[PDB]
Amino acid sequence: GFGGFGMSVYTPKKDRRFRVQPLPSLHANSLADDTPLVTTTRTLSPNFRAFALQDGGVFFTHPSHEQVMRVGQNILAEETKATGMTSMDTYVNSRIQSIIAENTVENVALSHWRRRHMWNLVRTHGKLQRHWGVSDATK
């Protein structure tokens, strides 16, 4: 500690910044000069292919965003095909499909359409029952 006996103490403001997570250490792998520190090997690593450029750069060829999303959707289907899809599973599947096929931005809440069309789910038995295109011309 940097306190000491003669030196006076002060109350330092606690550091509340966001800290990076610690990483596992590998002594020999870190001391070797051919092995990097980062060790990432995942499913799409063989899809991420490397090439050498004449100017010293590395040219990476990868599957597209839609292809990665489709691989994830196939994995989700393979997972849920055994015991069936729950509500969260079906929601995530529909969300992945919409992200794949949207080609645009969405600025409205996902529940607004359902809150507006809840009259299709809830039924009214009285004289005032809303149906599609209800108007005084119909009645």
Partner: protein, 52 residues
């Protein structure tokens, strides 16, 4: 303006990707070959002889 040519990060982009190996790993529930049988039984017998 905030735009993305490849596509913005979403929680289900790398969600179903998991850690892999760079080389084939020997399985614990693995049918031993004859050389593996010989080697492993020799190691077991060597430690047995030391203990005895």
């Amino acid at each position: 303006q905030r735009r993305s040519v490849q596509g913005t990060w979403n929680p289900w982009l790398w969600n179903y990707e998991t850690e892999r190996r760079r080389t084939e790993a020997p399985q614990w529930r693995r049918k031993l070959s004859e050389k593996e049988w010989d080697y492993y039984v020799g190691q077991y017998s060597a430690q047995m002889k030391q203990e005895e």
